[PDB]
């Protein structure tokens, strides 16, 4: 009436919960790159010679 060893298991199942990968879009930056410093339009000379 006691507990005895039974037949060895024939296989093992290991369960884990996993989600999946999306598409590669690689959206690097809101406003991207190093935007260049640049000329103010027209500007004009702010200096003249004497005479």
């Amino acid at each position: 009436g006691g507990l005895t060893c039974a037949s060895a298991p024939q296989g093992t199942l290991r369960i884990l919960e996993g989600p999946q990968q999306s598409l590669s879009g690689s959206p690097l930056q809101p406003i991207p790159a190093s935007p260049p410093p640049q000329i103010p339009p027209g500007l004009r000379p702010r200096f003249c010679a004497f005479g």
């Binding site: 006691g2 507990l3 005895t4 060893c5 024939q10 199942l13």
Partner: protein, 110 residues
């Protein structure tokens, strides 16, 4: 690839559990000579104690004891859950039951 239809007949009240044993010092080549006795805590009113169980295995030379509580209770019994699947090869149906894992260890007292 070979697959089986999964069914959790499981435990009617969840009170029912199977019993898995693991020996800390390896395998028993032919344990057919081992007698296992499962002990349960008499206190059924304390939810903490009502699930405490001791599994004892007796051989001619040594005794093994496993418990599901205290230091001997190990992390795998909770972080993970163990089940036993009984596969009917003919029907392809796998019946799945809750299992309790006991880590067995040798008995000596001063």
């Amino acid at each position: 690839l070979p697959s089986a239809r999964w069914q959790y007949c499981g435990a009617p009240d969840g009170s029912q559990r199977a019993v898995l044993v693991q020996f800390s010092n390896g395998k028993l080549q032919s344990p057919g000579n081992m007698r296992f006795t499962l002990y349960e805590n008499k206190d059924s009113t304390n939810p903490r104690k009502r699930n405490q169980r001791i599994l004892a295995a007796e051989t001619d030379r040594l005794s093994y004891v496993g418990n599901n509580f205290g230091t001997g209770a190990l992390k795998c019994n909770t972080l993970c859950r163990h089940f036993v699947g009984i596969l009917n090869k003919t029907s392809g149906q796998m019946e799945v039951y809750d299992a309790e894992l006991f880590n067995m260890q040798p008995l000596f007292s001063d």
